[model samples]
Target: HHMRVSFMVAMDENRVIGKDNNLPWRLPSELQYVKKTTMGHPLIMGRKNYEAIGRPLPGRRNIIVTRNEGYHVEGCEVAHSVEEVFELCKNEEEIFIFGGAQIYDLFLPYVDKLYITKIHHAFEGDTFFPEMDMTNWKEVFVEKGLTDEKNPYTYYYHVYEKQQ
Candidate 1:
């Protein structure tokens, strides 16, 4: 089977993804969605994203992409470039791009699937997920998340497959 390169991101209405390298929202369920979806896949993330996460996530292969050649993280594989990351994970059956922004942009063209958590409200953030042309992808699945005391905003889980 062809390897699946999936980009996983959660963003607000304005496409705001983060603030000061951290997620702007306080949704625990969103974090749970991420953990559940990518648990067994190879995770690819930028150096800053990895730092924001603090450590390697269990039950998956962690690959960090950084411009700094000397930068290294314990229990993680450090890669210098986007191309290098692809080369290293070429044999993997599935991979996920967990972003800080730059890494998301770099790997956008190569993404075969997109897992988006769309929050209904607009948020102020220093980081943003790159805008995508909806026409290039076909929505395959969608799950609407309920709003309650725990999850403040209404959210939707959308899965898209890149158009052939």
Candidate 2:
């Protein structure tokens, strides 16, 4: 059976995702949402992002993709390449890529859906989300969130499905 690979990311208007190996901004609600949305599925990410989190995220199967063949982390499996990610994800009904940058670029060609938390403001960062061709993805869902004291920037949660 083919595993359905998807992506989950929170990015700014400029597509900035991370700065200095960490998330560029604070959005507690967004983090909570991500945690809940990706709860059961196998979570795939690059080594840096996995380390950024500092440990295994509970309630999910963590798959870390790294070039180092001997690298391994407790409570996680290691894959040397994106092809290996595909191979390791075979049995899961749906696998989610909780990226860094490099992994997203590698898996973009294979992803069938994308779940994005689009922050309306621009952010200063060293890494960014890859530009996607809007024509190739159909927006299937979106929910606007209010900018409040709790979550400063206004944002939208979007779901895009690959076009036929």
Candidate 3:
């Protein structure tokens, strides 16, 4: 059976995701959106991303995917490989692939769904999301548009499912 791997992230026009290991934008609504969606679900992420946040996110089972031989988080399980993550996630109905750039790239081919928040503006950043390719996936859900004036920033939430 194929495990459900989903990417949850916010990005800009140039696909920038972060600057200096932190989220470049402040979007409380987006953070809440992530919490609501992944709550009670298992979330898999890279060690760097986990460290960037500085703690295990509450309300979800945090799993860290890493190549480092001796990395551990207080409340996280380490999976050294994608296949190992699949093994750990078999019983889970939904598994969220949270990020740092490397983790996103590593899991991209295996991810079945993507939950993305697209910000309207750009910032100078060192991290980015992979380019969106319509030939490979299709947008299955999108919320009505929102902007910084009314919200934290001009953005829209989208769910894209890979085309099998």
Candidate 2 stretches greater than 4 Å from native: none
Instruction: List model 3 lDDT by residue over 73-140, tens digit each.
Output: 78788999988888998888889888978989888777788898888887899998886566778889
> Cα-based RMSD of the predictions, in order?
1.5, 1.2, 1.8
Report the C-alpha displacement of residue 8, candidate 3, in angstroms. 0.8
Off by over 4 Å in 1: none
Candidate 1 lDDT (Cα, whole model)? 0.89
Give the per-residue lDDT of model 1 (tens digit) for 1-164: 25789999999999999998788988888889889999989999988899999988999999999889899788999988877887888888889998979999988878899999999998888899898887878999999876789999999999999887
lDDT of each: 0.89, 0.89, 0.84
lDDT of 1 at 121: 95
What pairs collide in candidate 1?
Answer: none
Q: Which 10 consecutive positions of candidate 3 have the poorest summed lDDT?
A: 144-153
Instruction: Give the 10-residue window scoring lowest on summed lDDT in candidate 1.
Output: 1-10
Q: Evaluate model 2: give its lDDT.
A: 0.89
Clashing pairs in 3: 148-153
Candidate 2, residues 125-157, lDDT tens digits: the string is 999999988777889999986567988888999
* All candidates: TM-score: 0.95, 0.95, 0.91
True lDDT of residue 151, candidate 1: 91
